[PDB]
């Protein structure tokens, strides 16, 4: 078995290898990359997502989210308070203000220590989940707005045509902005490209060990666990590396820098934080290997998780028994 310790793998495709996205994902899996839950892909040196980032300031963040924490430094939840709209130029200036800017630090490890020590005492503002793309239409390789759609994959594998669309999302971050522990909707893959700015640190649990993380989360968030049998779908809970290590949960960590792709694999729990002002683009995707994960994915039916239009069909076709109850949660 390849990669039996479930280490995060880093790949350096050539420009020739960068042509066929599906083929390269399958290659990475042949080497065991999925066992980690997360892989890094450094694009060939000839490749670029677009020519410059000089003209992005007028993108609107219609509903910036202030991420307010509750709990203790290593075990906390966050809720998202909606703020007034602002442009990317306005948000960058905010991120660079004295109140919100990255503190002085020695290296990424020092900054990670400062994040876990101090995150809960601040409420950074995240421009998350903004439909759109920063890939130039002329970028033909690994253009996250030109991927094969999940609906077409389900149709190719299973023969059933379904409604729904699959488009990317932009994320504008600042110091301490945080993504809570989660897997993707329907335990899909994700791909994330860091277009610009400061790094993003990731934590990930191997898919084969995901239920260990779930069990710990039920212990650490016991009221949330009584409320919902899949409360990590709410995307609000944080657990630090120190607490994971104290409880024996297998995980790995890695820092993504501007110009790099990350792929999350089916049922790979992940969480992380931004180092400073940045912009990322991410989208879900599927392969044939996903189908079985989609069929077994947990679902929130308590009503909190509220997701896209397109997840309806996935539940309806892959999880017909759950359909009824899950849809009640969505309506």
Ligand X SMILES: O=C(O)CNC(=O)C(=O)O
Annotated binding site: 126, 182, 184, 192, 200, 228, 234-235, 270, 300, 302
State the angle between helix axes of 311-318 and 150-158 in degrees (0 to 180), rounded to the nearest 10: 20
Binding site residue list for Zn(2+): 228, 234, 300, 302
- What does the alpha-carbon distance between residue 179 and residue 185 come to, in Å, rounded to a whole number? 14
Closest to Mg ion by CB, 56 vs 297, is 56
Closest to ligand X by CB, 67 vs 240, is 67
Instruction: Judge whether 311 and 185 are in contact, CB under 8 Å.
Output: yes
User: Which parts of 196-255 interact with ligand X (CB under 6 A)?
Assistant: 200
Q: Which of 154, 282, 297, 315 binds ligand X (CB under 6 A)?
A: 282
171 binds ligand X (CB under 6 A): yes
Mask for 291-330, x = binds Ni ion (CB under 5 A) = ----------------------------------------
Angstrom distances, CA of residue 316 to CA of 86, 220, 257, 310? 37, 32, 38, 10
- What does the alpha-carbon distance between residue 258 and residue 199 come to, in Å, rounded to a whole number? 6
What single-letter DSSP state applies at residue 149? P
CA within 13 Å, CB half, 118: 13
Which positions lie near Mg ion, rule CB under 5 A? 56, 58-59
Give the Cβ contact number of residue 31 at 10 Å.
13
User: Which parts of 166-225 interact with Ni ion (CB under 5 A)?
Assistant: 190
Give the binding range for Zn ion (CB under 5 A) out of 89-97, 227-235, 238-246, 250-258: 227-235
Interface with ligand X by CB under 6 A: which residues?
171, 179, 190, 192, 200, 264, 270, 280, 282
Interface with Ni ion by CB under 5 A: which residues?
190
């Amino acid at each position: 078995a390849q990669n039996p310790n479930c280490n995060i793998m880093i790949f350096h495709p050539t420009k020739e290898e960068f042509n066929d996205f599906d083929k390269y994902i399958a290659y990475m899996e042949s080497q065991g990359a999925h066992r980690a839950g997360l892989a890094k892909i450094i694009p060939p040196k000839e490749w670029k997502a677009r020519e410059t980032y000089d003209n992005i300031s007028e993108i609107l963040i219609a509903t910036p989210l202030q991420q307010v924490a509750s709990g203790r430094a290593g075990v906390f939840t966050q809720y998202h308070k909606k703020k007034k709209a602002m442009t990317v130029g306005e948000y960058r200036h905010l991120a660079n203000s004295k109140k919100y800017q990255t503190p002085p630090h020695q290296n990424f490890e020092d900054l990670e220590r400062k994040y876990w020590k101090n995150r809960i005492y601040n409420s950074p503002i995240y421009g998350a989940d903004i439909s759109g793309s920063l890939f130039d239409e002329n970028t033909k390789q690994w253009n996250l707005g030109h991927l094969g759609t999940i609906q077409d994959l389900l149709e190719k594998e299973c023969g059933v045509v379904i409604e729904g669309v699959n488009t990317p999302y932009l994320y504008f971050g600042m110091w301490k902005t945080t993504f809570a522990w989660h897997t993707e909707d329907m335990d899909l893959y994700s791909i994330n490209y860091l277009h610009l700015g400061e790094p993003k640190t990731w934590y990930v649990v191997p898919p084969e060990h995901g239920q260990r993380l779930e069990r710990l989360a039920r212990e650490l968030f016991p009221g949330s666990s009584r409320g919902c049998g899949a409360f990590l779908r709410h995307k609000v809970a944080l657990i630090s590396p120190t607490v994971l290590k104290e409880n024996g949960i297998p995980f790995n960590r890695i820092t993504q820098e501007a110009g790099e792709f990350m792929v999350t694999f089916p049922y790979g729990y992940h969480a992380g934080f931004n180092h400073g002002f940045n912009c990322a683009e991410a989208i879900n995707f599927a392969t044939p290997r996903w189908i079985d994960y989609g069929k077994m994915a947990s679902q929130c039916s308590c009503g909190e998780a509220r997701v896209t239009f397109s997840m309806d069909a996935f539940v309806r076709i892959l999880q017909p028994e759950r359909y009824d109850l899950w849809k009640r949660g969505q309506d």
